[PDB]
């Protein structure tokens, strides 16, 4: 698939199909690209495991259909799996799309006022922590004197953490020094499935 949300201990399977037979020569490999790392080959020649790769991984298939199976998923398995052929098998070498993984998602839960240092530059950024939450889906709203603000908000999510399998988000609201000083209350409001009512953090000048 283009996804894959599996709980630890459960099995996972990834399928790969090629438009032309590639059983000849080599050459079908599987790569794993953990967050913030370079791709790493796990299987080559369809079913041969690379050194270090756990027994949990098994590759099979023939001709045009390939499958990568993980008998028991562990936290360290998260990332992006790619299917690939040999550059000298069919030329040129090509890779499969995205290991089934694509998403969203970017705040902060803990709120910060602009630093004095920034105010001097004639700018004002309010920053708003939303750390260690799951699922990734979450909605953050900014209110300035009770009024919702859409303009000038930058959101940004971290990849799933391999240590606790949670996500964290950062939300920044940037205003001019002049506009920041014409208002009193600044609120960061988070809507997440874990709470019936949105979680609110704010401060008043």
């Amino acid at each position: 698939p283009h996804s894959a949300s599996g709980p630890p201990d459960q099995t996972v399977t990834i399928s790969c199909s090629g438009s032309s037979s590639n059983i000849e020569g080599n050459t079908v490999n599987w790569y794993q690209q953990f967050p913030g790392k370079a791709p790493q080959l796990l299987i080559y020649g369809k079913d041969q495991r690379p050194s270090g790769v756990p027994d949990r991984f098994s590759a099979s298939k023939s001709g045009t259909s390939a499958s990568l199976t993980i008998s028991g998923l562990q936290a360290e398995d998260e990332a992006d799996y790619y299917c690939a052929a040999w550059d000298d098998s069919l030329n040129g070498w090509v890779f499969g799309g995205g290991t089934k993984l694509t998403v969203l998602g970017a705040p902060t839960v803990s709120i910060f006022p602009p630093s004095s240092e920034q105010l001097t530059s004639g700018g004002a950024s309010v920053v708003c922590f939303l750390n260690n939450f799951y699922p990734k889906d979450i909605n953050v709203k900014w209110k300035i004197d009770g009024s919702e603000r859409q303009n000038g908000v930058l959101n940004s999510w971290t990849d799933q953490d391999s240590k606790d399998s949670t996500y964290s988000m950062s939300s920044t609201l940037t205003l001019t020094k002049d506009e920041y000083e014409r208002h009193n209350s600044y609120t960061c409001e988070a809507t997440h499935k874990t709470s019936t009512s949105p979680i609110v953090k704010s401060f008043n000048r």
């Binding site: 910060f112 920034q118 920053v127 240590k163």
Partner: protein, 217 residues
């Protein structure tokens, strides 16, 4: 041990040229066929070029044929990729690989940004708590890295000693300037007890700044 280390990336204007190098160590470099693989922002892996230790020297992706040259210096254990007539489509992380069938070893990768926008150093602002409600147990500190170009910046806390409980958020682009933030959660007895600092490196502008987190008055 085996290692590949790339260098030579950065900002380049459309039509301009760049030369990436890869430095190999921990294996007989002359023995292996080496490649460059690229990955455009938020996209997939794409083979670029190969050089085999034969009599000849190379294969290229069609789109880069005539613009890119892949070469090696076996005496210096280095692989090279010469990039001319760079297009916006060329922006991506370039990885050096030492395949055996099969890319078994990858470099960390180096980001190449093809853009007209100017290099702009980041303004780094220390984010100290503005409330006393969050005291004791765990205190969260922030670093705001604002108005830089191009990517990337590196953010560490206390030169790397502070690794756990760190969330460094992916940068957002706005008017050819990136902004990111990083939070760190430490025991309240660590801060402001001992110094906490964020270390920001923006090699594109050779910017290297440290911002100690000092409590507000």
């Amino acid at each position: 041990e085996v290692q590949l280390q790339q260098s030579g990336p950065e900002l380049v204007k459309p039509g301009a040229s760049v030369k990436i190098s890869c430095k190999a160590s921990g294996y007989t470099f002359t023995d292996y066929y080496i490649n460059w693989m690229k990955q455009k922002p938020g996209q997939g892996l794409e083979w670029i070029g190969r050089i085999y230790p034969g009599y000849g020297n190379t294969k290229y992706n069609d789109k880069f044929k005539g613009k890119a040259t892949l070469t090696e210096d076996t005496s210096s254990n280095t692989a090279y990729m010469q990039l001319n007539s760079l297009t916006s489509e060329d922006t991506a992380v370039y990885f050096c690989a030492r395949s055996l069938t099969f890319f078994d070893v990858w470099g960390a990768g180096t980001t190449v940004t093809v853009s007209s926008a100017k290099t702009t150093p980041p303004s780094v602002y220390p984010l100290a708590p503005g409330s006393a409600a969050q005291t004791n147990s765990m205190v969260t500190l922030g670093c705001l890295v604002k108005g830089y170009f191009p990517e990337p910046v590196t953010v560490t806390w206390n030169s790397g000693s502070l690794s756990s409980g760190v969330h460094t958020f992916p940068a957002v682009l706005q008017s050819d300037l990136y902004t990111l933030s990083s939070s760190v959660t430490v025991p309240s007895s660590t801060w402001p007890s001992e110094t906490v600092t964020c270390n920001v490196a923006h090699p594109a502008s050779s910017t290297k700044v440290d911002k100690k987190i000092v409590p507000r008055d």
